[PDB]
Amino acid sequence: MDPTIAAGALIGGGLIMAGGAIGAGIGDGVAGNALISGVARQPEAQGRLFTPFFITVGLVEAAYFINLAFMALFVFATPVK
Template sequence: MTDELMGSALLAGAVTLAGGAIGAGVGDGLAGSKFIEGVARQPEAQSRLFTPFLITVGLVEATFFINVAFMALFVFATPGQ
């Protein structure tokens, strides 16, 4: 395997992982801020808002772990090994 191919695979993996981390951070932050905003507006609705909040955060984190899987694919399954 050439060094150029390995470097490209590592760069693709790093960009994928960084994009997933940034996206997960932004998504969790937005979901958390809207949850706090909703609870501040209607404190009695906290129990109704908490379940959709957890589902949203779980889906956002799932996309991050899918990105981790793609990063591993780019880095460890490069052609020519």
């Protein structure tokens, strides 16, 4: 009875982590593309570009970890016992 639920929880946590990884990796990559281009064109702008960057990143990474948290909820404290 419980082993099927354990397999389901493991596959669900894997899906959560995979989605979080895809989203976070690609979003950070796009934001960093913007940052590297802006700093390559104008070096002195580096500082004033960290303010939008770490806002965007701050959102993106948020998703990942939020998902990370929920992955734990699936795998360590399975919502169905």
